[PDB]
Amino acid sequence: TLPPAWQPFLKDHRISTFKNWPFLEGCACTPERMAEAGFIHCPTENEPDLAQCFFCFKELEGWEPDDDPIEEHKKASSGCAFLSVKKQFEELTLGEFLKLDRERAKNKIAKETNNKKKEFEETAKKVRRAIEQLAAM
Amino acid sequence: TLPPAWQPFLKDHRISTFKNWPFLEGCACTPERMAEAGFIHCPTENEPDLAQCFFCFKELEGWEPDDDPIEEHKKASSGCAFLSVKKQFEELTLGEFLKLDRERAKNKIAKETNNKKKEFEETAKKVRRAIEQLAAM
Ligand SMILES: [Zn+2]
Ligand SMILES: [Zn+2]
């Protein structure tokens, strides 16, 4: 049905992204529970339990079986409008839904900005060090 | 911003299809008016004022300046759900909107079916007349 860009708004889409997730039956942080919290699984060679809110884009690793994903999302990112959304998908008005997607688009830009900044700052330090060293010789 | 498949639900998208529409300021069937009624312009060399409901797919030609496009859509296609939609786009719930699109998908199939019927019937005549010409000898 829905365009790719929008699928992550659907719990079932999100749940389906957890394949090879280690915390199943018996655990607090099940794929159902991770997805109810907004998380999408997106693991790396390095961090294979990496999860991301689809809406605010915060990443969390180091999950333990007892972790309650809502309490964790709340702790890591209290700003996230998804956490205030009470209604189900189909109960939302298009006005509301379009508003939420505008905000997600902004959240995304923000993370891309803040990233480019940290990378730029780190480059600035390499360049600066290198010119200190040259002045020194 | 919205998938192509869905744009026609938007008045302004529909208005924008009227390219070379002859009934403008002064007329009852203005593009704004046609669009409010669900029509998209889709002319041919042959029928250059051809207009189609985006929702029930009824086609109407032979438009005159005093024609009110809602009264005409009502006359030509009394059972078109778009005509019951009182709410604006943004006021609809996704559940409602998904329901409406399911129905437009059915209306489309139905029209593709009824068209294929007419084509079959018109072929049936060519075959019939061709066989009569052969038997007569
Ligand atoms: Zn979030
Ligand atoms: Zn119609």
Curated annotation (Swiss-Prot), chains A, B:
Signal peptide range: none
Processing after translation: Ubiquitinated by the Cul9-RING ubiquitin-protein ligase complex, leading to its degradation. Ubiquitination is required for centrosomal targeting. Deubiquitinated by USP35 or USP38; leading to stabilization. In vitro phosphorylation at Thr-113 by AURKB prevents interaction with INCENP and localization to mitotic chromosomes. Phosphorylation at Thr-44 by CK2 is critical for its mitotic and anti-apoptotic activities. Phosphorylation at Thr-30 by CDK15 is critical for its anti-apoptotic activity. Phosphorylation at Ser-16 by AURKC is critical for regulation of proper chromosome alignment and segregation, and possibly cytokinesis.
Gene Ontology BP terms: apoptotic process; cell division; chromosome segregation; establishment of chromosome localization; G2/M transition of mitotic cell cycle; mitotic cell cycle; mitotic cytokinesis; mitotic spindle assembly
Chain positions recorded as Zn(2+) binding sites: 53, 56, 73, 80
Effect of residue 63 to A: Disrupts interaction with histone H3pT3, no effect on interaction with INCENP
Effect of residue 113 to E: Mimics phosphorylation. Disrupts subcellular localization during mitosis and prevents interaction with INCENP
Main location: cytoplasm
Inducing or repressing factors: Up-regulated by COMP.
Effect on the protein upon substituting residue 58 to R: Increases ubiquitination and blocks dissociation from centromeres
A GO cellular component entry from the record: chromosome, centromeric region
Positions of modified residues (Phosphothreonine): 30, 44, 113
Subcellular location: Cytoplasm; Nucleus; Chromosome; Chromosome, Centromere
Modified residues (Phosphoserine): 16
Function: Multitasking protein that has dual roles in promoting cell proliferation and preventing apoptosis. Component of a chromosome passage protein complex (CPC) which is essential for chromosome alignment and segregation during mitosis and cytokinesis. Acts as an important regulator of the localization of this complex; directs CPC movement to different locations from the inner centromere during prometaphase to midbody during cytokinesis and participates in the organization of the center spindle by associating with polymerized microtubules.
Recorded family membership: Belongs to the IAP family.
Subunit details: Monomer or homodimer. Exists as a homodimer in the apo state and as a monomer in the CPC-bound state. The monomer protects cells against apoptosis more efficiently than the dimer. Only the dimeric form is capable of enhancing tubulin stability in cells. When phosphorylated, interacts with LAMTOR5/HBXIP; the resulting complex binds pro-CASP9, as well as active CASP9, but much less efficiently.
Protein name: Baculoviral IAP repeat-containing protein 5
